[PDB]
């Protein structure tokens, strides 16, 4: 069919990657935008995320592809950096262009990428310094990294919260977070807050008197299949159709109810005495009266209306396990949380589970009904806690606002490696693109992206000073005694994906329709 | 019906699908690579090494956009390699010589062209091929990581150099000539999800997935012996035929286990005369092969005959009827080794064979599932090196000098041969020195110069012993740099691309039918 | 939604929806509404008066409108008034915006700019209050609170209806130790007078009222969706038209048929038996000659409020009532609220939580219009009880709110400081909203609230007397809000509106 040679092709690649990521540089540090995509839904959004808006919903590119493949690299794998790394992308394309346009050959324009991407990778080492698990050394990386992704104010209430989530781990090396992201909200009249709350709290449980309000060994019969059928884990059918089978199941129900409680009694009798120690059936469906009364009246704790997610935190964080059936679990199996405690504030009752054996779980209540406020904080609640989580599994995280970008670029200087222009031209691109980082942030705010820049490359010029733009204003400032530092963890896996997407487009030619 | 088509107006449909194709894998060919990007018409992203691989995928002309895949397909079959090579090759030369030579009137001398500039080119070829040592994995190392490279991996390729190497010395024809050169049935290519290195051994023999599949089939009785029917089993895996009727709902279900219970009666036979093996080349289902495994049985089945009796000399069995039944080893022991390395509980056996018919199935492990295909590609473009230096211990040091090597000692001899026949000769000889200034391109410089000197230098000093590179775009010895253009390599990759030149050049019409 | 381009939503879309989103609140809040004909996918003229009925009944394709009118409508949830105030300050300061993105400034920028000074005018307003009265168990200080709550979204009786639900607001409880998110529940009967309407409490069924009062103190209630034509879950009730000698067996056994029914039904206990379906003739023959009350052809929402206040299920299967099919009342007493002859529950001690305001009239026009006034009557009475705080009302204040914000954008200095003089006058957009509905003159009602300095007490309202603007006491008028009916909706005219300029295009294949 068709045939688009080379730079008639590469066109299109070049233009559809720069073409999205341009506007998509509106985001870096608190200062960079807010970007709306709304997909073909409708859903209004906010995301400073660098990622979030591609993979949704986008302008239909070749690069699309690829764009909404690097940029999962760094959200996916580290959590954040995605504000800071699609721009990258084809930040290092934009020089290198120029440098084509000498009839400089895709190939010794890719061979070039990857060459002073090791200087830099080098130089991330090279640059970071430890820095504590503490606190607020978490809070500083946080309120950089945490603002590597979104604006600062929602990820400055995440500079506290999260902090405490990915240190409330038992103990986590995962990059990411899993348990500990717990997402409640109660639907709250002022505008907005995360609640942080430690352990697993059920979105649902059913607290009546005759149960144990405060359960000190509570032990967990998780519960789905309800008083309404008997010995399954999976509910069967129902019967509306006929007036006699209407019949059927509402008498019979008596033989659910109770062989249920059953079990529920027996198995209190058996692990928790009766009044000596607390039972806890959660119940993850409705609970019948007769034993939402009968399972209170023994003692059992019956949770109503748990979630499959308040089940798995349950279980590791309880350090038992969890069930189907209102019928007996294991003493063992059964879910052990040393605090089994119903609060109901508001709309939602909530089942804390607490005294975990080793809890994995923590939970984030967030508040408002609009989704002006959700959106915006939702979506930075997972790139909150795992792009902190990135500062305590790493003591190692690499200082921000682009102090680590001019602190190479300079020792970058072109023909450090001298030999020729072709591996030069990568990292001479590449000492190019590294700036974006303090020139994004200048971009967003005053002066130039260049007039502060080559006021804080002559500021880095100086002597022992690590000097970045300021994530707000646009202007000079030392990122290392400012107390922003990027995750390394973010910062390896920027420059990884960054320079190998635009080096596989530099290998492609022809393309064919 | 009636219609009529001419003569260089078809030639030139014959050049232009192809004059295509000969641009793109061009440039991904050697040490100067790129890639071929495909667009969808929904966007998707393609690209890869292989244009043909973009043209199966894309719309594919009537036109040698037809035969540039086939005739590739056909350099596919043989060596595995220079398919890349002869798509453009081929178009070229025809977009070269033809219209040269037809404005001086002839396909005539052209048709003797081709061969002419063959002669010499496969002529001097063996002339400055040089030998390299079959008994060394090292002196065979610098051919077939040259090889493996003319692709561009030496990733797996010293690991190929270490497995495959020997192996296809270990790859015997029944026939008991050539062996040396080997067609993929008594050498295959056949891999394991998974792995690591180690879990690749150098398997020089047939691998069969199904020998041990589980454990309770065979384990490590190191010369087994595979039973075919015949006696612990028989010839009938069958159907009693049952008469069936609309009253009798019983009667549908006696004859679906009638396949069976013959397939279990068969095996009930080997759960009674119980051997170490039975391959039940008719096949075994899962009902009556679960039966072998409480006998102490490996169930080998559904491969086939040629296979089995290969594996049978390969792995040490033999067909005999019954396992009671004995009468002689045709093989006591025919491994060279046995082994069972699983990936997960599924089994996988390995018997390297040495020097027997079998499979010499080259075990080939990616660090993981993905890159298990590059390992297969390249212990394939190993044994194309391995049959190529236990054939030929000539190779030429080259392929951006050994293209040069034939191009200007071709028209060399046109000093010698003259006549009319030269000028289709240089015609068709003219187009072969451009691959290496095709990657001398993307070496940056001047592509041009660079083989002008080094065209020089090819009667000068050397030509493809001391000569071009695409790694170097200049002159080195090939030979002591280590690039290797393998003798069986080019009497084939130009070969099919002159086949297809004369062809499409004697192809002068094409007919509705 | 639509794929766009050009980063057009921030200076066009943004700037669009807020005006667009306008005229609601502008030249409708205060003393005055002023009516939009809505036609909503059923096809009825609907006055809207005010802005959340409107923006209810403006389905929102703006990606930044439908940020916005959602925060809007939550006034209505949390105070019941400004929730026209919402959006006449929202945008205006959000237009302002954009003449500050012809300054060059960044869209982050101007945006923390009103977020500082709206947290400033949330310590500006409580100073602004002037003194506080709450009582709720009465009518009068209730009415003259929540009468600008109607007045606004309402141009229809205001101290009239004013009094109407601060009879009910409070009445339903007879003493408001709080209010409830909504206790009255509203009867809707038109005809007669629109003064007519009155207030009762307890359920009111506008439709069938049949049986026969079996106890008029016990109202103890059956409640059915479910069809008490024969038509029952112990055994076949087929009604047979098969044959003129099928259906004879109906006219034999229905008697039998309603038999197993009604008792069924009142043997487990009833007394109203509250029918969402119907009851056939032999049915109805035997429920009549039984004297079981049937309340009958009932509406869900005649099912459901009832429902709704004594607690209860309308179930399509006919069963024996359980105390959840079982509701009980202060009484079932057939009689009129708003001179229509239906059947009238009582709910205030027993369950409470429902009281009727009949809305009458010759149109549901004029239902609607004295439906808004009850309903904003409602929640702002909740408001009352929240807090006795009353400020003086719309645009009275604004001066105080402009003023300081003036000298606070004075001392606002580093950028944002035209940003925060763009957030000083939008409080002065409120006599200019209450100026063009008047067709009076914004600024110079601004420049009488200047420099005189009256401070919370010069306003230009929506009268008659709007024909020459005059700046009249808010304090005085009737009008009268709160802090937090202000804090509520400065809080909510920003938040969406704040945040609905930060965002950027849409992108879209």
Known sequence: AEVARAQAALAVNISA????????????????????????????????????????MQIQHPTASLIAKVATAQDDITGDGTTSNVLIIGELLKQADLYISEGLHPRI??????????????????????????????????RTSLRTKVHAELADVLTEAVVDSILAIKKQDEPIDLFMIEIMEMKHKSETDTSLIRGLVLDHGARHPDMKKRVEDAYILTCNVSLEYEKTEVNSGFFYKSAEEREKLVKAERKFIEDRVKKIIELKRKVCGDSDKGFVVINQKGIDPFSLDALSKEGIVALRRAKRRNMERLTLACGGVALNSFDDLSPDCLGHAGLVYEYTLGEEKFTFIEKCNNPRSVTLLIKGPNKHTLTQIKDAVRDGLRAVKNAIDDGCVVPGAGAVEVAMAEALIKHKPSVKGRAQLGVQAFADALLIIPKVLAQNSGFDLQETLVKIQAEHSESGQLVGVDLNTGEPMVAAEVGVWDNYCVKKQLLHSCTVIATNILLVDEIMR | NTKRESGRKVQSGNINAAKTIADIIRTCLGPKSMMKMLLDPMGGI????????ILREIQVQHPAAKSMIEISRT??????????????????????????????????????????????????????????????????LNIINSSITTKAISRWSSLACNIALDAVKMVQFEENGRKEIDIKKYARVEKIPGGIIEDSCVLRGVMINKDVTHPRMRRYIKNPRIVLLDSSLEYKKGESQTDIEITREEDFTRILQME??????????????????????????????????????????????????????????????????????????????????????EYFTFITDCKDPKACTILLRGASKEILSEVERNLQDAMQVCRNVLLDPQLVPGGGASEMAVAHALTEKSKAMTGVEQWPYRAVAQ??????????????????????????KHTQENCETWGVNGETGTLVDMKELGIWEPLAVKLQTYKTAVETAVLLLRIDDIVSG | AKHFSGLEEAVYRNIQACKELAQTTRTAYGPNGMNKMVINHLEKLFVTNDAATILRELEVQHPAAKMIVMASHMQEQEVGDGTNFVLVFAGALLELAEELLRIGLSVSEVIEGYEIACRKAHEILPNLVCCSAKNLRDIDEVSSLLRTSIMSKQYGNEVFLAKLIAQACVSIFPDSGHFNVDNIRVCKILGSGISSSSVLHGMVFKKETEGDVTSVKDAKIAVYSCPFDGMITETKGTVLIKTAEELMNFSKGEENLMDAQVKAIADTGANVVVTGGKVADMALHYAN???????????????????????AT??????????????????????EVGDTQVVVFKHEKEDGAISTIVLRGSTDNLMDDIERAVDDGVNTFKVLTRDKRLVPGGGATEIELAKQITSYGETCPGLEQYAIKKFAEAFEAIPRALAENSGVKANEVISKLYAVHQEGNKNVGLDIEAEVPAVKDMLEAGILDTYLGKYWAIKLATNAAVTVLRVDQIIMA
């Open chain 1, 17 to 56: 990657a720069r073409g999205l990521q341009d506007v998509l540089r509106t985001n870096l540090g608190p200062k960079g935008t807010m970007k709306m995509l709304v997909s073909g839904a409708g859903d209004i959004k906010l995301t400073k995320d660098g990622n979030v808006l591609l993979h949704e």
């Open chain 1, 109 to 142: 324009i890719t061979e070039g990428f990857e060459a002073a991407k090791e200087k830099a990778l080098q130089f991330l080492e090279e640059v970071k310094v430890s820095r504590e698990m503490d606190r607020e050394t978490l809070i500083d990386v946080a």
């Open chain 2, 46 to 53: 393609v690209m890869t090494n292989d244009g043909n691989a």
């Open chain 2, 75 to 140: 350099q596919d079959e043989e060596v595995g390699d220079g398919t890349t090579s002869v798509i453009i090759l081929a178009g070229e030369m025809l977009s070269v010589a033809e219209h040269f030579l037809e404005q001086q009137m002839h396909p005539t001398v052209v048709i003797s062209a081709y061969r002419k500039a063959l002669d010499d080119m496969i002529s001097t070829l063996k002339k400055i091929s040089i030998p390299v040592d079959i008994s060394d994995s090292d002196m065979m």
């Open chain 2, 260 to 345: 069976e219970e013959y397939i279990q009666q068969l095996c009930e036979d080997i759960i009674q005369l119980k051997p170490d093996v039975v391959i039940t080349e008719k096949g075994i289902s899962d009902l009556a092969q679960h039966y072998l495994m409480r006998a102490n049985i490996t169930a080998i089945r559904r491969v086939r005959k040629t296979d089995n009796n290969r594996i049978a000399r390969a792995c040490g069995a033999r067909i005999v009827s019954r396992p009671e039944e004995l009468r002689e080893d045709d093989v006591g022991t025919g491994a060279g080794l046995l082994e069972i390395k699983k990936i997960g509980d």
């Open chain 2, 431 to 456: 187009a072969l020195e451009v691959i290496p200034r095709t990657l001398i391109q993307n070496c940056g410089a001047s592509t041009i110069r660079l083989l002008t000197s080094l065209r020089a």
């Open chain 3, 289 to 311: 000659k039984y004297n079981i009350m049937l309340v009958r052809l009932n509406s869900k929402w005649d099912l459901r409020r009832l429902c709704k206040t004594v607690g």
């Open chain 3, 314 to 335: 309308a179930l399509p299967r006919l069963t024996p009532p359980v105390l959840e099919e079982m509701g009980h009342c202060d009484s079932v007493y057939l009689s």
